[PDB]
Design a protein around this ligand. Structure first.
Ligand SMILES: [Li+]
Ligand SMILES: [Li+]
Lengths: 138, 13, 138
């Protein structure tokens, strides 16, 4: 077999974070949202099984699973933290997933709200036929 | 353009 | 839009050339053979439409086409020369073909036969679906 194939897929990870007009009861000062998606409204669900957001252990039910888009978690809290994100693929072969350690940072009041975007490129070398087709629908 | 003839030839190195 | 791919295929160009025991009537001193193939019996016919071997114009009917493997020409002659080889793809979009200028050299009586191999790599970026599947059957 003398052919080979590299498939690349572009993801966007990001988050928004806003100082709340008034803290919640529990002392939560900020609202935030974090997300994984395709650039330009592309559909990554073709090859993505699920996204797992691992929230800091201070949160109830810290392991947030999204089986369907939008792949995101919306929360309120008092501090940033490093938020492991696992993107699982619709394949049956390595790699089954990829992990990003997402820096979920807040700004203090006085500073503008956070709107952060992090671009990531995945490369799959010689995926199976099934998977290759899934990737290339995205 | 020319197809080549089907005349078989002995191998050689 | 999120996804993209690069398909690579390997070709082997080559030639054999042997001083004949006895010159032919026209004074041809050598037999030679030139070929295009895939490495290790791989089937390039899946994406190759035809190969055109452009023989020196000293040869009658110099432009020799093989639509089907083996993609080769066997000839007798007296002199090495540069032999343009055109590999046409079963493609519906640029590029439709690629050209190699193949150095078809002869060694003198006294030397062992020529047996030359030249490896070539083709890269197709974001081929059509039809073509991608052809390339990846190879
Ligand atoms: Li999904
Ligand atoms: Li062919």
């Amino acid at each position: 077999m003398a052919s080979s194939c590299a498939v690349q897929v572009k993801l966007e990870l990001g988050h928004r974070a806003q100082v709340r007009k008034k803290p919640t009861v529990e002392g939560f000062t900020h609202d935030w949202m974090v997300f994984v998606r395709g650039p330009e409204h592309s559909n990554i669900q073709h090859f993505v099984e699920k996204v797992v957001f691992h929230l800091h252990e201070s949160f109830p039910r810290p392991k947030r699973v999204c089986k369907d888009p939008p792949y995101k978690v919306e929360e309120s809290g008092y501090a940033g933290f490093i938020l492991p994100i696992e993107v699982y693929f619709k394949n049956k072969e390595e790699p089954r997933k990829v992990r990003f350690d997402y820096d979920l940072f807040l700004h203090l009041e006085g500073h503008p709200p956070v709107n952060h975007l992090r671009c990531e490129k995945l490369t799959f070398n010689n995926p199976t036929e099934d998977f290759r087709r899934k990737l290339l629908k995205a | 353009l020319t197809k080549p003839t089907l005349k078989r030839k002995k191998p050689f190195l």
